[PDB]
């Protein structure tokens, strides 16, 4: 029993971080079999990176892993990433994938400093492609990332901290979550919204605990609570959304659309002064998946 | 910039994570040089330990480190912690120490079904010696933690969820933390109450992060303060907390009885429907050490 914010054990990504350095630069990267990764403004000197890198060669970057030296010995662009080839391989590489993530899904956050980890969190991606991280200068590099069983899903490499305090940053291809760009503008996150699915589940997971003050005998349809739902700045729940809480809606023996007139009472009334799981807020970033593992007992290795 | 409640990297401490078999009993094990250490409540058959310990033998303790089988060629008894003495010393042994923390202090948990790690999370020791972890069947001989430069620093092994759904455990000594023992008895845990010194250095976090709605004209003295801390259950304030929240004082230039004024005020008014720091409560598992360390930098390995 109880309920926390968990993140997957780290050691696995621990050993692919590294140091990398060009110019007065110094950031974090990514080494995975002879490849490391690494935002790409790193390099020298508005910008124009095929521009830049044209001007640069292997002997510029400078690649610590630990006390060892590592001697780049290619490297390329794939949008905002740089891939420095090195002449070894990475003998802790992990079994691992890239995958992008949708806005709402979770994933774990490896803060670094000149490649040496910091600290480890859970975090949300937000329905505005920003989340809401935990980062100091120097921490451009870290990666976010799932483990599933064995593998290592990475998901996110840290670019940039915006103007209201939220983060930005791009999948392992380079590619950045949001309209985003890694030079300097004018660019704000959109308005926010708040994930309805799962504050659903984290529902779901304070029953299975206990807190039961705020079902209800009421029950309502889609479609009416989409209604209160939109005045409320809340995602739309779809007939899918519904379908991932079955499970957690047998476990519990409560019907997804009788805990949505529950989360309908709760936004229109408040909470009272009464706390749900240790919160006097309704949360948000716990998938119906994050419940199911943190209320069931599956582990990974 | 950001605040988030943030946990060591454990890769290090993966590695020395075991499972240890006896009887129908399975549970973790940790793994330090050539010993195993593990709850004693793992062995045999209301209970009388020294007398169920003389009745089992070495070939009865199936220790496994992944894959590999770990030949155990002696046991002992230490409080309520079991050392299992195996042929083997673990390469992968940290720097390390065993250390009893305090109240108030915070640490790690890795927590772990089957010697498999599951998830990291933060948290703190209770005023009452519990902690709100999240355990599930099969945690017992989880291990809480704290990691400073490259040294990891054990404090806590997982034993036993009481009545409420809290927790209790031991240090790595196998003395327990609180009044509790590693037998079926009525043992609940004792009211607790709010870490005040923890509070003040996460409303210095806040003001740290932008959040300054709550700050004061107004000033008090220790004793007026404490009047009004005893009344919502809250620790007293020493001389000593002052002391240490002394840098956070100085890097937001407030004082820290102005502090303590602003949480008067919050304690006796509520917060109007405001949030800080992306809570409705008042927090009290960040220490003075957690929040200079997110918020100046300080990294380990």
Redesign the interface.
Known sequence: ????????????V??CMVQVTCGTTTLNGLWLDDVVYCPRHVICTNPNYEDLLIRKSNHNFLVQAGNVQLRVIGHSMQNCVLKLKVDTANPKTPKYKFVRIQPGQTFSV?????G??????Q?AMRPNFTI???????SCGSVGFNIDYDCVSFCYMHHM?LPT???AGTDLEGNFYGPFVDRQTAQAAGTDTTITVNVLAWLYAAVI??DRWFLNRFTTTLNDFNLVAMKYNYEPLTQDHVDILGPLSAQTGIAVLDMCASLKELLQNGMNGR?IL????LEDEFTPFDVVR????????
């Open positions: 029993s109880g309920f926390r914010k968990m993140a997957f054990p780290s050691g696995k621990e050993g490896l803060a670094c400093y000149n040496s980890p910091s600290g480890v969190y975090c809401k991280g935990s980062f100091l200068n120097g901290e305090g939220v983060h605990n206990g706390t240790g919160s006097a807020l943190q209320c069931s007992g599956v582990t990974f290795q």
